[PDB]
PDB file of C-alpha atoms and ligand atoms in Angstrom:
ATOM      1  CA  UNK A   1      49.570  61.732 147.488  1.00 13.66           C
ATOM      2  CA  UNK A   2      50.262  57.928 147.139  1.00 12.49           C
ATOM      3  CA  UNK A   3      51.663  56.304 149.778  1.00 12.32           C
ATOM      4  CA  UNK A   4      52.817  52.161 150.403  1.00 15.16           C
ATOM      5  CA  UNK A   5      52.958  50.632 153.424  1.00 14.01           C
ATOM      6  CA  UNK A   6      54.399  47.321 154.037  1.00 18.64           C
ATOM      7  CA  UNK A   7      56.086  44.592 156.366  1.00 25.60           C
ATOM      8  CA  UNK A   8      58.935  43.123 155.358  1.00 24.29           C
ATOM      9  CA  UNK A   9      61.018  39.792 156.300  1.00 23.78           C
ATOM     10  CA  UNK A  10      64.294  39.612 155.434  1.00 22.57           C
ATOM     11  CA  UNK A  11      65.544  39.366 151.832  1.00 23.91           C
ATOM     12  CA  UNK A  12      62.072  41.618 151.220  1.00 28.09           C
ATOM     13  CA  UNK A  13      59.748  38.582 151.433  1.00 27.82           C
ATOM     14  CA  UNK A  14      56.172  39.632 152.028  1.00 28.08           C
ATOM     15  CA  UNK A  15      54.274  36.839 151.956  1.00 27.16           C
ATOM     16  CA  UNK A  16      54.216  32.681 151.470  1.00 25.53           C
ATOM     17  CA  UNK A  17      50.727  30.971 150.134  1.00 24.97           C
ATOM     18  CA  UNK A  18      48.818  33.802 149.775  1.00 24.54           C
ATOM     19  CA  UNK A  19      49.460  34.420 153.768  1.00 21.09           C
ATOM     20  CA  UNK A  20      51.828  36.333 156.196  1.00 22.80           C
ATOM     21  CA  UNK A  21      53.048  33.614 158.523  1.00 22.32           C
ATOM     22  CA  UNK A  22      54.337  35.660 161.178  1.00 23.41           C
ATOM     23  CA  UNK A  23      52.298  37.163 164.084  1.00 24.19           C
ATOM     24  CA  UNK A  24      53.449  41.111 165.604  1.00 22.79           C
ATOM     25  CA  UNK A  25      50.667  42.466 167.078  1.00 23.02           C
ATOM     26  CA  UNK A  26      52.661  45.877 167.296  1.00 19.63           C
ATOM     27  CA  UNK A  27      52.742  45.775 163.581  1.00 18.90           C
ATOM     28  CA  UNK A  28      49.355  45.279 162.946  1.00 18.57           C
ATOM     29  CA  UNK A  29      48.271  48.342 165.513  1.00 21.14           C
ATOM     30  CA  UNK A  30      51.176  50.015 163.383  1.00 21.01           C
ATOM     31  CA  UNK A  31      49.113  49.642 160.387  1.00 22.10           C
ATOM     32  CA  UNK A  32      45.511  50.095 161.796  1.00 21.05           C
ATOM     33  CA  UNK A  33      47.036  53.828 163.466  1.00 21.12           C
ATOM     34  CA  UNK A  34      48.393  54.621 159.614  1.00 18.02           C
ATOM     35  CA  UNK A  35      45.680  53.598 157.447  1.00 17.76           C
ATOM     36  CA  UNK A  36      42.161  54.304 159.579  1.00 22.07           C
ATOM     37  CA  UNK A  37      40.419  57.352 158.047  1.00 19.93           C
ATOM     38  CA  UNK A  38      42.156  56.575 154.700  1.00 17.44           C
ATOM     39  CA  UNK A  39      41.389  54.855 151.059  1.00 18.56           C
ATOM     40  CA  UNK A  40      43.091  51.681 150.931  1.00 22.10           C
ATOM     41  CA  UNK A  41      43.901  49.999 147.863  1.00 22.08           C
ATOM     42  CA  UNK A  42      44.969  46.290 147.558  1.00 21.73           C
ATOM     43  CA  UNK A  43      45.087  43.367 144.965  1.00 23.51           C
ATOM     44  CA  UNK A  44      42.772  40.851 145.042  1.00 21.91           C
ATOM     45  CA  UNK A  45      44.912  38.182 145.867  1.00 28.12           C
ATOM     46  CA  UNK A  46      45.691  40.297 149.200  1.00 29.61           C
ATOM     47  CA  UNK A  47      41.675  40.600 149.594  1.00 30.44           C
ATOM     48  CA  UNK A  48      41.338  36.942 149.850  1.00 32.33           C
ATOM     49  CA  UNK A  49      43.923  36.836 152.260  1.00 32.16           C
ATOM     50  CA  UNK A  50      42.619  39.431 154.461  1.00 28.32           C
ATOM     51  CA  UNK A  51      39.266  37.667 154.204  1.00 29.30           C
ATOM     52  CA  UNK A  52      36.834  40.857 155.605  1.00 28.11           C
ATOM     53  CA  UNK A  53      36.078  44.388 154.833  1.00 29.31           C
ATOM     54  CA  UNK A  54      38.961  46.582 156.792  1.00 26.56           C
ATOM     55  CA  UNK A  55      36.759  48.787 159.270  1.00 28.25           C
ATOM     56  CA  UNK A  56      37.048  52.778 159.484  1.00 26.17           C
ATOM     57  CA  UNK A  57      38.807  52.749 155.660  1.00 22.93           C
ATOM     58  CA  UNK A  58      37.599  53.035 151.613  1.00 21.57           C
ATOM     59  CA  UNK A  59      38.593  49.359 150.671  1.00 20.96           C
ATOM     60  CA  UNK A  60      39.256  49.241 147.219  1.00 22.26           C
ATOM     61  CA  UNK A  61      40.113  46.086 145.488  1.00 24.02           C
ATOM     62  CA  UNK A  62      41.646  45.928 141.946  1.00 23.70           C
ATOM     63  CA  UNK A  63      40.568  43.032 139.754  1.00 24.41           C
ATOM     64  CA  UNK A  64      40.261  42.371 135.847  1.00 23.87           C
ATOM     65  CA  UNK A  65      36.580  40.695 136.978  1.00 22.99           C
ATOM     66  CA  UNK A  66      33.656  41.758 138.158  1.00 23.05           C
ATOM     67  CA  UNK A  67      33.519  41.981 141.760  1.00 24.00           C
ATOM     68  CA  UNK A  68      31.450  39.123 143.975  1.00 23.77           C
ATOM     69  CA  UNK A  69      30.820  41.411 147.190  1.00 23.26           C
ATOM     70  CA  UNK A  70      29.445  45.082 147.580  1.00 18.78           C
ATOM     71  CA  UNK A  71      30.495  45.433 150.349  1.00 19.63           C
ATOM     72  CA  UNK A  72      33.917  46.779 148.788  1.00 22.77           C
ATOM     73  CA  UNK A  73      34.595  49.380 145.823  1.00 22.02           C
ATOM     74  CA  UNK A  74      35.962  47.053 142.715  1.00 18.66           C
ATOM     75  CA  UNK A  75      38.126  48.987 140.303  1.00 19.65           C
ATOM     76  CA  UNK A  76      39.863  47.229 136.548  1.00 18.92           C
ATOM     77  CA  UNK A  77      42.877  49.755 136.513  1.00 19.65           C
ATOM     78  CA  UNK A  78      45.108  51.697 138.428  1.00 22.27           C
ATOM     79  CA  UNK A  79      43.845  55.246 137.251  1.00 23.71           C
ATOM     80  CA  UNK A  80      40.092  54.073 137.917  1.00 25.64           C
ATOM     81  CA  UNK A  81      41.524  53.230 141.553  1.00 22.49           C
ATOM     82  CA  UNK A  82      43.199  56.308 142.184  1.00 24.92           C
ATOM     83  CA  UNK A  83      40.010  58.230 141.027  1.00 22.11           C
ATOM     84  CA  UNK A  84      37.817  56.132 143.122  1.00 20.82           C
ATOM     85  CA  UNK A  85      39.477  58.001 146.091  1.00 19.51           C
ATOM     86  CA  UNK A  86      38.071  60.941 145.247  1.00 17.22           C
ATOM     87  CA  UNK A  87      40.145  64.271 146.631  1.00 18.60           C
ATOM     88  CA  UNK A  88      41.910  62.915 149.914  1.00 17.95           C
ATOM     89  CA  UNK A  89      45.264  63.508 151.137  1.00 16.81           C
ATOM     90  CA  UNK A  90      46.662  60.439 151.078  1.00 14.62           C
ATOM     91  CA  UNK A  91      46.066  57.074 149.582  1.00 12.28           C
ATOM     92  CA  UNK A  92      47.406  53.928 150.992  1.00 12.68           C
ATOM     93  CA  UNK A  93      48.272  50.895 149.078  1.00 13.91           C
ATOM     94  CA  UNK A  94      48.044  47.904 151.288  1.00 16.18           C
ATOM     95  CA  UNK A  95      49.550  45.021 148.283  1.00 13.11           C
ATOM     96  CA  UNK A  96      50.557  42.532 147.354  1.00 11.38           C
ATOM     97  CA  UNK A  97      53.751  42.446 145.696  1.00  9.71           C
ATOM     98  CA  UNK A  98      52.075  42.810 142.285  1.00  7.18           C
ATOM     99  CA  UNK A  99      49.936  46.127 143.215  1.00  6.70           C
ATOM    100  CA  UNK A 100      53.293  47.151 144.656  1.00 10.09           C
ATOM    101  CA  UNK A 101      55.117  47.091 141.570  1.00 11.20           C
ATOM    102  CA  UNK A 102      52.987  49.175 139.807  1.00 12.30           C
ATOM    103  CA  UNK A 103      52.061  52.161 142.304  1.00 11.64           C
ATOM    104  CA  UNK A 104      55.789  52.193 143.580  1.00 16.06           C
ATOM    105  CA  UNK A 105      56.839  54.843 140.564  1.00 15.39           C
ATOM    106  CA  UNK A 106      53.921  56.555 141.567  1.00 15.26           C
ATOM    107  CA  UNK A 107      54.156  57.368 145.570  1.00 17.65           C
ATOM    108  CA  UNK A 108      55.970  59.744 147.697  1.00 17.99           C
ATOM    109  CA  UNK A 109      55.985  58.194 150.684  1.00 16.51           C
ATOM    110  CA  UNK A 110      56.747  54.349 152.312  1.00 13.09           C
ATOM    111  CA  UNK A 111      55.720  53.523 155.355  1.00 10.56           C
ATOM    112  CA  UNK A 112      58.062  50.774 156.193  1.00  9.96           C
ATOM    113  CA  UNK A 113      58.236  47.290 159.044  1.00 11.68           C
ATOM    114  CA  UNK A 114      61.472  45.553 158.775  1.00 11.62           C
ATOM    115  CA  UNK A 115      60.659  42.203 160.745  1.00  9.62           C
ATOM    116  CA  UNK A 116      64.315  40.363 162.018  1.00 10.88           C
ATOM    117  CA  UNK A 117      62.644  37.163 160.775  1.00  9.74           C
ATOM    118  CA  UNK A 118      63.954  34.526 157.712  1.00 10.38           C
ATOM    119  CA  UNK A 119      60.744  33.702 155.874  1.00  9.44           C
ATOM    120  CA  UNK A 120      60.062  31.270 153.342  1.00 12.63           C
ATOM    121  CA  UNK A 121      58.179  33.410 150.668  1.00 13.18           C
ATOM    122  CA  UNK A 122      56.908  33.352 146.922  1.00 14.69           C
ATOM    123  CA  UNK A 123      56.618  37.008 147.184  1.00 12.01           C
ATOM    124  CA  UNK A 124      58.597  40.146 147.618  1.00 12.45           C
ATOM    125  CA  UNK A 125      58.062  43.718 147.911  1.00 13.77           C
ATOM    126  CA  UNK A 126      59.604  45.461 144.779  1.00 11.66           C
ATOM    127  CA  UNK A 127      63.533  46.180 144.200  1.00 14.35           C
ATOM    128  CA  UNK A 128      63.750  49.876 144.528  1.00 12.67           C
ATOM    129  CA  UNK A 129      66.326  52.121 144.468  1.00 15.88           C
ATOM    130  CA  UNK A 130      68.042  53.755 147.834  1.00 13.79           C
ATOM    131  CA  UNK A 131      68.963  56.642 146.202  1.00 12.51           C
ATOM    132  CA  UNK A 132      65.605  57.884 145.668  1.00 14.69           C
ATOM    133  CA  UNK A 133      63.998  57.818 149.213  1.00 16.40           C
ATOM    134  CA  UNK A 134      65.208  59.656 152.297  1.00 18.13           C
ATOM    135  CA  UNK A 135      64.481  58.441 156.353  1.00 20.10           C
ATOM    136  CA  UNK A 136      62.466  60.382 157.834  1.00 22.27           C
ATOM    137  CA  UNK A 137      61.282  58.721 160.783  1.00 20.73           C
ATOM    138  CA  UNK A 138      62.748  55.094 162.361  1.00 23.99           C
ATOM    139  CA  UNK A 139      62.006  53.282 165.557  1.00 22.24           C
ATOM    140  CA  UNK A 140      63.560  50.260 166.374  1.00 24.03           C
ATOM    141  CA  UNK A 141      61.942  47.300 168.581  1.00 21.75           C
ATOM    142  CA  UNK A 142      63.214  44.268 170.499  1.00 18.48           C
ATOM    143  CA  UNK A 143      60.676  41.294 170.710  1.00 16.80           C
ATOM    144  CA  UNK A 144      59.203  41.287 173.791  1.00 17.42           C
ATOM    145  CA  UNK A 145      56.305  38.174 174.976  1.00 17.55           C
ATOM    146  CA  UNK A 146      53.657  39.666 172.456  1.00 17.53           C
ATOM    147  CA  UNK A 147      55.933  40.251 169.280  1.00 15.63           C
ATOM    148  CA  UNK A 148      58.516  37.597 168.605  1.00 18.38           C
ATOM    149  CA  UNK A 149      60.732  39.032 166.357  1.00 22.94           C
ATOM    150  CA  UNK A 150      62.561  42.555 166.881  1.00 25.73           C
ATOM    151  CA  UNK A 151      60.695  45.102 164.164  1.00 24.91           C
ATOM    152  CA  UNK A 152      61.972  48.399 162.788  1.00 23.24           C
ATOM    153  CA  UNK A 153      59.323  51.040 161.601  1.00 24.98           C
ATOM    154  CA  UNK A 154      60.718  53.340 158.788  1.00 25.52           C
ATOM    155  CA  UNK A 155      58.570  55.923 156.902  1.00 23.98           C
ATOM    156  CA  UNK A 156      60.698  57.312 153.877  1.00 25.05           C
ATOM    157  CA  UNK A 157      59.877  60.332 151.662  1.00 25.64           C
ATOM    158  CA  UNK A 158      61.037  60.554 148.020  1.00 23.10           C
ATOM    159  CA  UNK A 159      63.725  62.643 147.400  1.00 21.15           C
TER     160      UNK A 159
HETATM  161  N1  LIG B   1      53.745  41.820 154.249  1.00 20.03           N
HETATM  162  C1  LIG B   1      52.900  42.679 153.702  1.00 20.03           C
HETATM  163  O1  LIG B   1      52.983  43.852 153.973  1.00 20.03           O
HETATM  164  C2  LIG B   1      51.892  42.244 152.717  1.00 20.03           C
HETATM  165  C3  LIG B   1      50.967  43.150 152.249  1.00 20.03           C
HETATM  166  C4  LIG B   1      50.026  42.768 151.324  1.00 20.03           C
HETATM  167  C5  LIG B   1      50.048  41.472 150.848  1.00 20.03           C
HETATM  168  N2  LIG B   1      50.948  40.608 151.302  1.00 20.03           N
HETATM  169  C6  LIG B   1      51.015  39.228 150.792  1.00 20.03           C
HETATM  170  O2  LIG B   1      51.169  39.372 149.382  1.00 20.03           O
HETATM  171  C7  LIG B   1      50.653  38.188 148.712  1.00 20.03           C
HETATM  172  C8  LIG B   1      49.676  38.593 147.604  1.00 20.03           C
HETATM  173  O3  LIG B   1      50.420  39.345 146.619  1.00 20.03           O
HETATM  174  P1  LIG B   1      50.274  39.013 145.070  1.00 20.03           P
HETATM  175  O4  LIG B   1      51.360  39.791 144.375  1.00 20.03           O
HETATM  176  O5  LIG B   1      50.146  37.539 144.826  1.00 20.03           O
HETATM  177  O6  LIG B   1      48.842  39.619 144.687  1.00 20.03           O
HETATM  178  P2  LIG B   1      48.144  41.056 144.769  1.00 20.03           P
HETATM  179  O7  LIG B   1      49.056  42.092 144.289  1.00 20.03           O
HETATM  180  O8  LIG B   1      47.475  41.158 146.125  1.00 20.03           O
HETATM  181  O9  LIG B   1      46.916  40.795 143.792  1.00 20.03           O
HETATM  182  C9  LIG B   1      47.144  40.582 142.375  1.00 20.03           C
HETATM  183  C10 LIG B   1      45.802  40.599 141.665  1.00 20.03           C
HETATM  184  O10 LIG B   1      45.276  41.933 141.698  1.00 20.03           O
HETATM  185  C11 LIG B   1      44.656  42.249 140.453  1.00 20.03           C
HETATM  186  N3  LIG B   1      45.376  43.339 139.815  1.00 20.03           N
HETATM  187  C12 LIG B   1      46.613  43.817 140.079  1.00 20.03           C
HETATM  188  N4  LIG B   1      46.886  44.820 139.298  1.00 20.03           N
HETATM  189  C13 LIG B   1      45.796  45.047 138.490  1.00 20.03           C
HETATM  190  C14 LIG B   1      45.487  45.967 137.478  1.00 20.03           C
HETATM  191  N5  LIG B   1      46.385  46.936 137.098  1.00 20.03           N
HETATM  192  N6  LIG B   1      44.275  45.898 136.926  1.00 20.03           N
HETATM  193  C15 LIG B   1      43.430  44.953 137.318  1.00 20.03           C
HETATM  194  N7  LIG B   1      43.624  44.047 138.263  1.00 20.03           N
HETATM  195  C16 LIG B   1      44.824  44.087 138.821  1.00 20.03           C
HETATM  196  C17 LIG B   1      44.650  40.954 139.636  1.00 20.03           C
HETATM  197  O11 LIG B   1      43.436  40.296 140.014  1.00 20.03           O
HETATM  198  P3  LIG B   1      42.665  39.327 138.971  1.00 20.03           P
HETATM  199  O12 LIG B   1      43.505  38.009 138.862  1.00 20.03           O
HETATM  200  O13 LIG B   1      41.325  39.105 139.578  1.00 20.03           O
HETATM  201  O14 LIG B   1      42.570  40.193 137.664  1.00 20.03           O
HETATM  202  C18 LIG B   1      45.912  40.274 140.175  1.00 20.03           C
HETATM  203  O15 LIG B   1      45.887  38.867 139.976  1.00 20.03           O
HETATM  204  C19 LIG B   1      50.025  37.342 149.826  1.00 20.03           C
HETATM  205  O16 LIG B   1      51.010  36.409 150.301  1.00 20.03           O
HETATM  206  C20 LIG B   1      49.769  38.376 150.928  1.00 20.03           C
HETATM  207  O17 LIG B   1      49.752  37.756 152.195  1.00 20.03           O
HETATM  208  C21 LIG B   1      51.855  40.957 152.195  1.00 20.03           C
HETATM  209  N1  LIG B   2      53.156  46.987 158.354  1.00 22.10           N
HETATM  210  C1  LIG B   2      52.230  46.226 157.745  1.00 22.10           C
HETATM  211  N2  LIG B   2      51.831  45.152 158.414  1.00 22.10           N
HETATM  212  C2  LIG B   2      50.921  44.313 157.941  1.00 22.10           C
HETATM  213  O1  LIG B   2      50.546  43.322 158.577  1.00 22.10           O
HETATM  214  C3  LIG B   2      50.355  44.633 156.636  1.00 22.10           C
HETATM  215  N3  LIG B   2      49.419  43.833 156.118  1.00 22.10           N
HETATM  216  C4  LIG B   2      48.946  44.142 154.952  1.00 22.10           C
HETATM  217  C5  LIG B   2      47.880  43.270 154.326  1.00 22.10           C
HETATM  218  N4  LIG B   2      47.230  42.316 155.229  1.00 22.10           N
HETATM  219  C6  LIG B   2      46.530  42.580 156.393  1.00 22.10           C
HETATM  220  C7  LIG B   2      46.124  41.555 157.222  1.00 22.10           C
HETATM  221  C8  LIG B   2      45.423  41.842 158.357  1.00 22.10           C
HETATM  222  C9  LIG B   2      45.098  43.149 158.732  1.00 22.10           C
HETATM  223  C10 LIG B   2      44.322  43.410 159.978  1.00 22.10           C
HETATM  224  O2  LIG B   2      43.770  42.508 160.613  1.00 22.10           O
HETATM  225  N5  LIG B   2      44.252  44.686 160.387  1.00 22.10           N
HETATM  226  C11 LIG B   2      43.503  45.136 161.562  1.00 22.10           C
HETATM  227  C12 LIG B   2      44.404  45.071 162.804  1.00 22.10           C
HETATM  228  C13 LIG B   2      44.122  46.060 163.920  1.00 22.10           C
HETATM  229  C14 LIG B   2      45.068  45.770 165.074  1.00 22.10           C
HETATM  230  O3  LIG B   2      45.643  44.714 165.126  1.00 22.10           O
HETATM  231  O4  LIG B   2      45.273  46.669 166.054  1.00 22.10           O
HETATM  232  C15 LIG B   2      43.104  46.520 161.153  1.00 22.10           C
HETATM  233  O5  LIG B   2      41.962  47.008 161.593  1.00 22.10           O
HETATM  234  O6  LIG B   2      43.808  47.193 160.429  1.00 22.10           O
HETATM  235  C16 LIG B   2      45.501  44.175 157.892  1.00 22.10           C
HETATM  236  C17 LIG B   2      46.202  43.891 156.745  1.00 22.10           C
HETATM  237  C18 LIG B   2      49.413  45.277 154.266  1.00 22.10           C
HETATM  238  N6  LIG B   2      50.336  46.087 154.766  1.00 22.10           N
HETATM  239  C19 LIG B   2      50.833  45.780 155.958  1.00 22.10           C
HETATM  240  N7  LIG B   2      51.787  46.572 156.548  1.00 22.10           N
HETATM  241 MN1  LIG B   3      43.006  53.109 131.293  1.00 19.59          MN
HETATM  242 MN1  LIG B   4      40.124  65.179 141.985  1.00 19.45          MN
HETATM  243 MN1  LIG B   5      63.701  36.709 164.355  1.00 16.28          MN
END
């Protein structure tokens, strides 16, 4: 099973310079809870933003060049990255908005932040359709002194 997970501003922006300019701590422990123990599969543009190996997780980067760091599993295509999982149960793809756009058609699951912020971005998390995804799980948060923007966790299941 594929699954994407993603924070997203408003109008779907995800990022802005190859960075996420926003800081919600809950979000991030979000993400940690729902991707330790698990593959994770990300561009390499959203590599060099991370900057490190994630801890506790497969990190597998897809690039058309050879990797520069062994520390990480480099893949060319997205079949040699879903068989570089191996047999797991799930598979999380962590970005960016092109990686996104090509595993989309191919997951069951979202794991969703809406963040009440208006962001600047140069990209977005992929058009999909409503129809095609039901809510199973939402939680809604006001900002509080460690988050500064109210946040909305959704995790939707394709229909
Ligand atoms: N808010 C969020 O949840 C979130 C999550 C993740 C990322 N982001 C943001 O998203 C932005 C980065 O997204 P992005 O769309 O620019 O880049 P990306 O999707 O992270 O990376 C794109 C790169 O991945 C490689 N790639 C993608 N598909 C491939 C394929 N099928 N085969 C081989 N290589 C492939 C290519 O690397 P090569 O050029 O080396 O071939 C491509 O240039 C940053 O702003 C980041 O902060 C936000
Ligand atoms: N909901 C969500 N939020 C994000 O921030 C996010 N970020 C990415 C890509 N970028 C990043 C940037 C930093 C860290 C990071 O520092 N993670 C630590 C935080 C642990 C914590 O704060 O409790 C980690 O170990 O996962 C992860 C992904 C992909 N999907 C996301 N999805
Ligand atoms: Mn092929
Ligand atoms: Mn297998
Ligand atoms: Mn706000």
């Amino acid at each position: 099973m594929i699954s994407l997970i993603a924070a997203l501003a408003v109008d779907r922006v995800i990022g802005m310079e190859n960075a996420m300019p926003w800081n919600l701590p809950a979000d991030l422990a979000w993400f940690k809870r729902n991707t330790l123990n698990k593959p994770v599969i990300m561009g390499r543009h959203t590599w060099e933003s991370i900057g490190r190996p994630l801890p506790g997780r497969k990190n597998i980067i897809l690039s058309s060049q050879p990797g520069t760091d062994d520390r990480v599993t480099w893949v060319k295509s997205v079949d040699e990255a879903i068989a570089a999982c191996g047999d797991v149960p799930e598979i999380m793809v962590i970005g960016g908005g092109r990686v996104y756009e090509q595993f989309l058609p191919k997951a069951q699951k979202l794991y969703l932040t809406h963040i009440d912020a208006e962001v600047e971005g140069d990209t977005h998390f992929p058009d999909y359709e409503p129809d095609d995804w039901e809510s199973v799980f939402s939680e809604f948060h006001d900002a509080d002194a460690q988050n500064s923007h109210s946040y909305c966790f959704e995790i939707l299941e394709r229909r």
